[PDB]
Amino acid sequence: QVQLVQSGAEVKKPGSSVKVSCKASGGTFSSYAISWVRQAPGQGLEWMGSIIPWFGTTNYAQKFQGRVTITADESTSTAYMELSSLRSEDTAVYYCARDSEYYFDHWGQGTLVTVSSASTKGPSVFPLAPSSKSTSGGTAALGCLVKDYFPEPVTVSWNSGALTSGVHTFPAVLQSSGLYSLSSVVTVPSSSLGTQTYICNVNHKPSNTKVDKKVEP
Amino acid sequence: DIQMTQSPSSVSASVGDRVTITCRASQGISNWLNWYQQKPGKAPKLLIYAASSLQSGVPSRFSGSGSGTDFTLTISSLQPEDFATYYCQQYSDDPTFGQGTKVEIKRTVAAPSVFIFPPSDEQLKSGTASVVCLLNNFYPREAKVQWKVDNALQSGNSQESVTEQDSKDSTYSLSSTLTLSKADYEKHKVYACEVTHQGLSSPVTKSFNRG
């Protein structure tokens, strides 16, 4: 299987530099180029450049020439994208992709880099307990409230990814304070609330927040 | 250099419908035109390369055609999982992308399932009270939530967001959070989320009495 695994989300102050990594599965570096593509949140896609891990040769898009450096470490099968002199408009999800020179056929999961001078804050995680007020025809809704964090993103899984059916993880809301909040909910059988364990796994990589919250009736 | 223009900006269509999306280049790019599918929050996925070559594992209902400047992506039988934004990309010169076409699915009316969550003991101890109202799996997306505290309409103390369309049942869900101080929360009895939606003939109230 082909997989490209990128480094975590980061906050960076204006004028600084960010370096995103991209760990490729075996065989990739010996047969393919690696491209970097960015996507401003709520916007479209923009190619930054490519590296051929074989020869170490690079090609950069005109608009990033001088600001971007793409490197490859063949010993670890890891590619890197460094973007210097960061400005507010460099806030985007950065993707690495396997590049045949004719298409991008596999893409990393993406890395959200937020360029901001504001303080990083980890969320509090509160349970949304199942009760008589969250039942409907034999089903029960439960969840987690992930409150007061900056910047994006928070990711939520349930039971370490083993619970996906009926999960809704909502887009973040921006509070008046500049902090974000989000909810993640799941609907389950009401019958088994006494025997099953439900844990929301909340990650906020910019603040090293990693919280596993058990949600009980 | 080469600019890509996609049409339309969005399409809404029923399951089984034929969907046609077009991509135009500012100059001739031969057949070096790729199509990607992107789900909200996820990485783009290659569907078609070299204008008309179907990527491995991609359903056959996807097809591409064109050469030169005018290109089309066709979904022959739209499925709920086809909800996504679709991007074209030229690779004749330095790669550039179209601005995307959002494809959404039309389906039958579904009323929301409405739930309410009082503040957790953990949060109350910290000095804040967030009350969450959940509207599950409704269609269409237009839904109205009003918060009432002791029958008094609230304003300025709530935030809400809606999900992207569901990839299996084509519905939407909505979460609304009412936030007040612990002190304010304990001055009132009844916390009510009142929901208006096409699938409901009258507003539906979901409420609890504090305690």
DSSP codes, A204-216: EGGGTEEEEEE--
Per DSSP (E only), the strands in chain B are 4-7, 10-14, 19-25, 33-38, 45-49, 53-54, 62-67, 70-75, 84-90, 96-97, 101-106, 113-117, 128-138, 143-149, 152-153, 158-162, 172-181, 190-197, 204-209
How many residues comprise chain B?
A: 211
Taken in order of first residue, the domains within chain A and their CATH numbers are 2-117 (2.60.40.10), 118-217 (2.60.40.10)
**Do B140 and B84 fall within a single domain?**
no
3-state secondary structure of A190: helix
Q: Report CA B86 to chain centroid distance, whole Å.
A: 14
**Do B124 and B72 fall within a single domain?**
no
**Do B166 and B193 fall within a single domain?**
yes
Q: Which two tokens stand for residue B16?
A: 């089984």
Q: Identify which of A113, A172, A135, A125 has the alpha carbon closest to the alpha carbon of residue B136.
A: A135
Write the CATH number for B83: 2.60.40.10
**Do B155 and B182 fall within a single domain?**
yes
Q: Is B117 exposed, middle or buried (0-12, 13-18, 19+ CB in 10 A)?
A: buried
- The CA distance from A22 to A80, in Å, is 6
Which residue, B80, B106, B132, sits at the end of a domain? B106
Q: Identify which of A100, A73, A85, A72 has the alpha carbon closest to the alpha carbon of residue A2.
A: A100
Chain B residues whose beta carbon lies within 8 Å of the beta carbon of residue A104: 34, 36, 44, 46, 89, 95
**Do B133 and B51 fall within a single domain?**
no
Q: Is A61 on the interface with B (CB under 8 A)?
A: yes
- Chain A nearest-CA distance from B13, in A, is 23
DSSP summary character for residue A161: G
The helix (H) or strand (E) run that includes residue B170 is: none
- The CA distance from B74 to B181, in Å, is 53
**Do B185 and B199 fall within a single domain?**
yes
Residue A80 carries which side chain, given as an amino acid letter?
Y
Query: In three state form, how does the secondary structure of A60-123 look?
Result: ECHHHCCCEEEEEECCCCEEEEEECCCCHHHCEEEEEEEECCCCEEEECCCEEEEECCCCCECC
- The CA distance from A165 to A153, in Å, is 22
Residue linked to tokens 């370490």: A160
Contact B175 A134 (CB under 8 A): no
Chain A residues whose beta carbon lies within 8 Å of the beta carbon of residue B175: 168, 170, 183, 185
Strands A104-107 and A111-115: unpaired
Q: Which two tokens stand for residue A32?
A: 């393919």
Residue A207 carries which side chain, given as an amino acid letter?
S
**Do B3 and B65 fall within a single domain?**
yes
Which residue, B106, B137, B160, sits at the end of a domain? B106
Contact A128 B117 (CB under 8 A): yes
Q: Are B132 and B117 in contact (CB under 8 A)?
A: yes
Sign, CA torsion B102/B108/B114/B120: negative
End-to-end Cα spacing for chain A: 41
Domain range for B39 is 1-106
Q: Identify which of B34, B22, B49 has the alpha carbon closest to the alpha carbon of residue B90.
A: B34
- The CA distance from A194 to B155, in Å, is 38
A59, A65, A67, A69 alpha-carbon torsion, rounded to 10°: 10
3-state secondary structure of B88: strand
Q: Are B186 and B203 in contact (CB under 8 A)?
A: no
Nearest CA in chain B to A165: B168
Q: Report CA A99 to chain centroid distance, whole Å.
A: 21
- B65-90 core/surface letters (b: 16 or more CB in 10 A; e: else): ebeeeebbbebeebbeebbbbbbbbb
Residue A170 carries which side chain, given as an amino acid letter?
F
- The CA distance from B81 to B60, in Å, is 14
Return the CA Rg of chain A: 20
Residue B164 to residues A40, A43, A171, B40, B171, Cα–Cα distance (Å): 18, 16, 9, 7, 9
**Do B56 and B97 fall within a single domain?**
yes
What angle (nearest 5°) sits at the alpha carbon of residue B177, between those of residues A142 and B166? 60
Residue linked to tokens 């450049």: A49
- The CA distance from B56 to A38, in Å, is 25
Which residue, B85, B106, B127, sits at the end of a domain? B106
- The CA distance from B201 to A30, in Å, is 63
Residue A8 to residues A19, A104, A105, A140, B19, Cα–Cα distance (Å): 11, 22, 22, 33, 37
Phi, psi of B185, deg, nearest 5: -55, -40
Q: Identify which of B27, B32, B77 has the alpha carbon closest to the alpha carbon of residue B52.
A: B32
Chain A residues whose beta carbon lies within 8 Å of the beta carbon of residue B130: 126, 145, 147
Nearest CA in chain B to A153: B41
Q: Is A141 on the interface with B (CB under 8 A)?
A: yes
- The CA distance from B66 to B165, in Å, is 30
Contact A170 B161 (CB under 8 A): yes
- The CA distance from B39 to B82, in Å, is 9
Residue linked to tokens 């600019």: B3
Residue A134 to residues A141, A187, A190, B87, Cα–Cα distance (Å): 5, 9, 10, 40
- The CA distance from A198 to A210, in Å, is 16
Return the CA Rg of chain B: 23
